[PDB]
Design a protein around this ligand. Sequence first.
Ligand SMILES: *[C@@H]1O[C@H](CO)[C@@H](O[C@@H]2O[C@H](CO)[C@@H](O[C@@H]3O[C@H](CO)[C@@H](O)[C@H](O)[C@@H]3O)[C@H](O)[C@H]2NC(C)=O)[C@H](O)[C@H]1NC(C)=O
Ligand SMILES: CC(C)CCC[C@@H](C)[C@H]1CC[C@H]2[C@@H]3CC=C4C[C@@H](OC(=O)CCC(=O)O)CC[C@]4(C)[C@H]3CC[C@]12C
Ligand SMILES: *[C@@H]1O[C@H](CO)[C@@H](O[C@@H]2O[C@H](CO)[C@@H](O)[C@H](O)[C@H]2NC(C)=O)[C@H](O)[C@H]1NC(C)=O
Ligand SMILES: *[C@@H]1O[C@H](CO)[C@@H](O[C@@H]2O[C@H](CO)[C@@H](O)[C@H](O)[C@H]2NC(C)=O)[C@H](O)[C@H]1NC(C)=O
Ligand SMILES: *[C@@H]1O[C@H](CO)[C@@H](O[C@@H]2O[C@H](CO)[C@@H](O)[C@H](O)[C@H]2NC(C)=O)[C@H](O)[C@H]1NC(C)=O
Ligand SMILES: *[C@@H]1O[C@H](CO)[C@@H](O[C@@H]2O[C@H](CO)[C@@H](O)[C@H](O)[C@H]2NC(C)=O)[C@H](O)[C@H]1NC(C)=O
Ligand SMILES: *[C@@H]1O[C@H](CO)[C@@H](O[C@@H]2O[C@H](CO)[C@@H](O)[C@H](O)[C@H]2NC(C)=O)[C@H](O)[C@H]1NC(C)=O
Ligand SMILES: *[C@@H]1O[C@H](CO)[C@@H](O)[C@H](O)[C@H]1NC(C)=O
Ligand SMILES: *[C@@H]1O[C@H](CO)[C@@H](O)[C@H](O)[C@H]1NC(C)=O
Ligand SMILES: *[C@@H]1O[C@H](CO)[C@@H](O)[C@H](O)[C@H]1NC(C)=O
Ligand SMILES: *[C@@H]1O[C@H](CO)[C@@H](O)[C@H](O)[C@H]1NC(C)=O
Ligand SMILES: *[C@@H]1O[C@H](CO)[C@@H](O)[C@H](O)[C@H]1NC(C)=O
Lengths: 123, 124, 116, 287, 256, 107, 36, 31
Amino acid sequence: QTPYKVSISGTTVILTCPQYPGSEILWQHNDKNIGGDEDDKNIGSDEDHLSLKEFSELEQSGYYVCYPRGSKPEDANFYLYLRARVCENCMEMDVMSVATIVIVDICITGGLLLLVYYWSKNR
Amino acid sequence: QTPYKVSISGTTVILTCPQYPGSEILWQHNDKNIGGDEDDKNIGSDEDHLSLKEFSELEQSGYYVCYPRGSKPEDANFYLYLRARVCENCMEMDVMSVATIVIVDICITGGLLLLVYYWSKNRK
Amino acid sequence: QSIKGNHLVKVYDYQEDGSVLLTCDAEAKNITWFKDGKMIGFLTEDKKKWNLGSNAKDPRGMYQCKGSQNKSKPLQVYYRMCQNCIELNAATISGFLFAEIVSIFVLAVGVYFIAG
Amino acid sequence: KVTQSSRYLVKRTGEKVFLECVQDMDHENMFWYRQDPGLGLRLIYFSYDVKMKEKGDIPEGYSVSREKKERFSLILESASTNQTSMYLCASSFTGPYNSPLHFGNGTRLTVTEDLNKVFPPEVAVFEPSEAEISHTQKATLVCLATGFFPDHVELSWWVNGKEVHSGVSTDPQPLKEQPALNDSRYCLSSRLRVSATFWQNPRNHFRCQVQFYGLSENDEWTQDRAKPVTQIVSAEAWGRADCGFTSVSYQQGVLSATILYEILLGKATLYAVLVSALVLMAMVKRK
Amino acid sequence: QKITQTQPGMFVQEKEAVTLDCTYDTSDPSYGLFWYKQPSSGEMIFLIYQGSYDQQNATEGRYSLNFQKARKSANLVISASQLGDSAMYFCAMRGGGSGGSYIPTFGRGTSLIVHPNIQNPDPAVYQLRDSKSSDKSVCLFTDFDSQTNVSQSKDSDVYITDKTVLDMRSMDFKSNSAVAWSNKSDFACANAFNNSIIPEDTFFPSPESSCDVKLVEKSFETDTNLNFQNLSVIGFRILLLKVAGFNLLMTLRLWS
Amino acid sequence: FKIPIEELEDRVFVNCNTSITWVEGTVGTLLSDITRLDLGKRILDPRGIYRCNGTDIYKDKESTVQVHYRMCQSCVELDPATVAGIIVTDVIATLLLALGVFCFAGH
Amino acid sequence: QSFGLLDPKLCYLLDGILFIYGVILTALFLRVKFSR
Amino acid sequence: GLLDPKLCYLLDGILFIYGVILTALFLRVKF
Ligand SMILES: *[C@@H]1O[C@H](CO)[C@@H](O[C@@H]2O[C@H](CO)[C@@H](O[C@@H]3O[C@H](CO)[C@@H](O)[C@H](O)[C@@H]3O)[C@H](O)[C@H]2NC(C)=O)[C@H](O)[C@H]1NC(C)=O
Ligand SMILES: CC(C)CCC[C@@H](C)[C@H]1CC[C@H]2[C@@H]3CC=C4C[C@@H](OC(=O)CCC(=O)O)CC[C@]4(C)[C@H]3CC[C@]12C
Ligand SMILES: *[C@@H]1O[C@H](CO)[C@@H](O[C@@H]2O[C@H](CO)[C@@H](O)[C@H](O)[C@H]2NC(C)=O)[C@H](O)[C@H]1NC(C)=O
Ligand SMILES: *[C@@H]1O[C@H](CO)[C@@H](O[C@@H]2O[C@H](CO)[C@@H](O)[C@H](O)[C@H]2NC(C)=O)[C@H](O)[C@H]1NC(C)=O
Ligand SMILES: *[C@@H]1O[C@H](CO)[C@@H](O[C@@H]2O[C@H](CO)[C@@H](O)[C@H](O)[C@H]2NC(C)=O)[C@H](O)[C@H]1NC(C)=O
Ligand SMILES: *[C@@H]1O[C@H](CO)[C@@H](O[C@@H]2O[C@H](CO)[C@@H](O)[C@H](O)[C@H]2NC(C)=O)[C@H](O)[C@H]1NC(C)=O
Ligand SMILES: *[C@@H]1O[C@H](CO)[C@@H](O[C@@H]2O[C@H](CO)[C@@H](O)[C@H](O)[C@H]2NC(C)=O)[C@H](O)[C@H]1NC(C)=O
Ligand SMILES: *[C@@H]1O[C@H](CO)[C@@H](O)[C@H](O)[C@H]1NC(C)=O
Ligand SMILES: *[C@@H]1O[C@H](CO)[C@@H](O)[C@H](O)[C@H]1NC(C)=O
Ligand SMILES: *[C@@H]1O[C@H](CO)[C@@H](O)[C@H](O)[C@H]1NC(C)=O
Ligand SMILES: *[C@@H]1O[C@H](CO)[C@@H](O)[C@H](O)[C@H]1NC(C)=O
Ligand SMILES: *[C@@H]1O[C@H](CO)[C@@H](O)[C@H](O)[C@H]1NC(C)=O
């Protein structure tokens, strides 16, 4: 099984429809057609991905389904349950990143100090 | 118009109603009249004020409305939604307080350092 | 808080994420929002609530909403949560005094030695 | 779909009371029934079709109007304490072959001889005992609504601003404070059971809400106390961890550390300025 | 033309089949039988119908109707009973509405109570913490077996509710509960349920408190502000370290 | 035909009418009810792909559901001005330390 | 039981770095003092 | 366990002064 691709950046969420590479697709959220209306600036459907801007956790969380055009949207048998807490300017980072940035900062400071001391000792 | 004034000093919260000058005021919380001649010392009302003593966040947070006597609550032109936490001793660390504390610590530290420096120079 | 009286703005609080939301009583599909008079945005049939952000930032001000007929009466929101208030108990003052005396002693030794 | 005018009503003796019943299934036969404890359903009135008024088992003191096909209204010309009960409305087709009745939601009607007796409830919430949490790793909050009349209340639980249906048990019917004697007020209780970890998170908010149906705005009130109108009475609680390390303690510790390190940084930079000034002065004065 | 139900009030365990009886008599040869269910809310819900001139008893989900014209008995049978079946069941029959006897008649009604399978009895009598806004003292009799039935309090100032079933879907746990409360100084409810026949080995907690700090730290969670403050503290420590290093080097430069 | 995902007090559960087959991701915990699977707390970001059958009218057709959670227990807000300040302050501090080293080097 | 960027490994990482520096420096000092 | 940062702060407070004192003493003894 090839899963959905979900990308979150700031308050923008992009979902990718995996199992239909060579046909037009439609997206449906909680039994209601979404995207592809050429309006509603915050929602877009280009190529084979759905882009949701200014994502709201309270209202835009739930079921999502992708189905080919011309097929009744209940034959589909692969849904995505999405619940995301988005935030403006909020970026995610784990403890390993903080540990490594602190370590490299200490190392570069020590190296610079040693280099300056060796340069200034002789003269 | 002119908004309510909210003053917090410890566990006492005072609400001030600028509108209706010279007209005696009635106060409502959550559609219940308060501030009247009721047997309670925690809640008090005078000419234009409302003092809530030992403020409890769970019980006393919500909608407050100010209206002159003989009028109707919905005829008032303002509603205040107040939700607050209080302490007996919780002094707040904002930018100005931190700056003041840092500045005074620097000035006493510098004074003591200069005094001890002069003492050391004179002794040695 | 009566519709008869042009009181339409309500606060929708106590959420799992801490945000503060505003709700307009008007039945119009698109609702425009004003803060202290100046417009701050508009919403359509998909979104029913306006987000004021986390309550730890103490959202304060005056808000109105207008869908079709007229501007509702202002609602004044005031928050005071003490995300920065400090309890002045024994431990805090003891630690403060300990740090102060240790730092003063260290600096005093340092400035003593370099004297003269 | 059959609907009625309201679900709860309170009136005084000697007044005129109107009850409405509206259907939309094109039904010919209409029935107005009364339910009593220990008596069963009793047929008040029946209407075969439009402009038909025929007597029932207990027809005294009631009237109806069937001036329209889709309407069947009932009238208590002079309400009295004798007529306090639950009233139901039903609709059915013509012919007893395959025409069962279709009831609505019903209306509970209480008639008192003085409006002074109407009181709002008092709602309190009691937190779980630590003994239960230690013994079975579960918490049970109890909500009590006492001292109200008439028994026309509804109770609900809201956690984090959302209504909760799982893990809630409420009394089927309000009981009486003193059943021995008359004019007695009512009590109601409810239980919410939660896992222990969920309860002692200080970020969780629990609330018990009681909606009370009382007097309307079109009633004379000449009493010193407040007017007992339809309202909502609530009780709130925060998650409580009396023993242990919670987020509040960590937040306080971090704030204190921040202030202390800012002060120390200020002292250190003051000393740095002083020593730099001394070095520069020595270098200048040497030459 | 009359309908009678023999037994008022029935009890059944969960995941069982229960039969409620209805005996009728009539003179007309054409009629029909049907049933309604009325839960605690008050509404009447139509359940099942069966005519007089048709075989092949009707069946909807968990409901069925056992019909015996010769014995004149229409019985409602519910299979795989759940906890939602606790209601009042009414049996009714039509009549010849041509001459004078339309008169849809109704039965008296039978109560039904569904008892869960506890599967792990553990009776206990806890006392709940005070409200700080009320003078009542409330305590809870919980986790007892289905058979243990609670009696009312003889004392006038003590209020006791009947047993109630609670269901937790988060950990699929069923339980029975009762509450007793009063306003009096000497109300210590090791003896509040005196009139009731409580079972043996019922837990009575000690007045002292107990704790498990591991359980308390199991329910810990953070937010973005705490992360930002922690990072700020780390940065302040690093900056202080660097400034102190510079201070020390300059001091050894200017030692004396 | 969507596999119901329910959100009780603070956990998340998967509900089917038959046994739930795990395809990938979070293993989960069974409730002693075969037709229910517990994925744990929501703030721990349970993610996975599960599959199960159906009943009633859905006798002979599968269904697959992918659960994806994102709650920012590790997220942190970072305005560009703040990070610019952080790097410039750190560079100033390390330059000051290097200057101190250079001044100490002679003596 | 989620810590996020509150896991106690961070300040203890700083403390461990400072401890390692201190112990190696005091070992060097002690060796120099005994040698001279 | 031991998620209380009070111990962490006390430990680094001790280590800081110890480290600076030994740094000064060693840097003098070498030179
Ligand atoms: C798992 O099994 C349950 C039953 O054990 C299924 O719930 C049932 O789903 C059917 C849908 O085929 C519901 O029937 C519907 O009834 C309404 C009202 O009469 C009607 O208008 C619809 O057209 C449809 O016939 C049925 O009510 C429902 N049962 C209950 C108690 O609500 C469920 O769908 C099964 N789930 C899966 C994933 O197979
Ligand atoms: C730079 C050198 C000279 C060190 C300065 C003195 C040290 C001994 C300081 C540095 C950090 C200080 C600590 C910083 C933070 C705290 C948190 C603070 O947390 C609380 O428990 C108070 C809040 C509450 O208890 O409600 C208690 C003091 C303490 C341990 C301080 C004690 C003294 C310490 C270890
Ligand atoms: C209902 O109770 C009231 C008072 O408890 C009574 O109403 C009487 O109704 C009859 C109608 O036959 C009148 O003649 C009397 O004048 C009414 N009494 C009063 C005091 O108004 C009576 O006991 C009950 N009525 C019915 C019809 O059952
Ligand atoms: C009248 O009773 C019906 C029950 O027959 C109620 O319909 C229920 O409504 C709730 C929503 O609150 C649904 O969850 C139930 O599934 C409904 N039951 C049925 C059988 O459809 C109806 O809400 C009642 N009317 C009022 C005004 O409360
Ligand atoms: C409804 O179901 C009942 C239950 O099976 C049927 O009654 C049975 O009738 C047969 C016919 O001879 C008897 O042998 C059984 O003993 C009866 N069972 C019971 C429990 O009484 C009934 O016949 C069915 N209804 C119709 C119209 O056929
Ligand atoms: C519950 O209360 C009644 C008191 O009369 C008892 O339950 C009886 O149990 C027997 C056993 O089969 C039945 O035959 C009776 O019909 C029951 N009576 C009633 C009124 O339900 C019993 O004493 C109590 N339960 C326990 C466990 O003691
Ligand atoms: C879901 O039901 C289908 C049948 O509807 C099961 O598929 C069968 O799986 C067995 C393996 O044990 C095969 O031998 C059959 O040929 C399959 N039949 C069909 C029609 O696919 C499937 O195993 C069921 N899944 C679960 C988890 O029980
Ligand atoms: C609602 O009003 C806004 C205000 O500019 C407008 O942009 C929007 O198109 C309106 N909605 C509809 C459905 O016309
Ligand atoms: C709406 O506002 C206009 C002026 O802004 C006013 O003329 C009108 O009367 C208002 N509507 C109502 C119903 O009063
Ligand atoms: C209450 O008073 C009325 C009127 O005197 C009387 O009919 C009724 O029986 C009294 N209540 C009880 C429980 O006796
Ligand atoms: C308990 O409270 C009730 C309710 O007001 C009151 O009637 C009763 O006198 C109180 N009892 C005591 C002992 O205070
Ligand atoms: C309480 O129950 C015990 C059971 O042994 C009994 O002896 C005692 O009399 C009861 N107390 C009262 C006040 O009835």
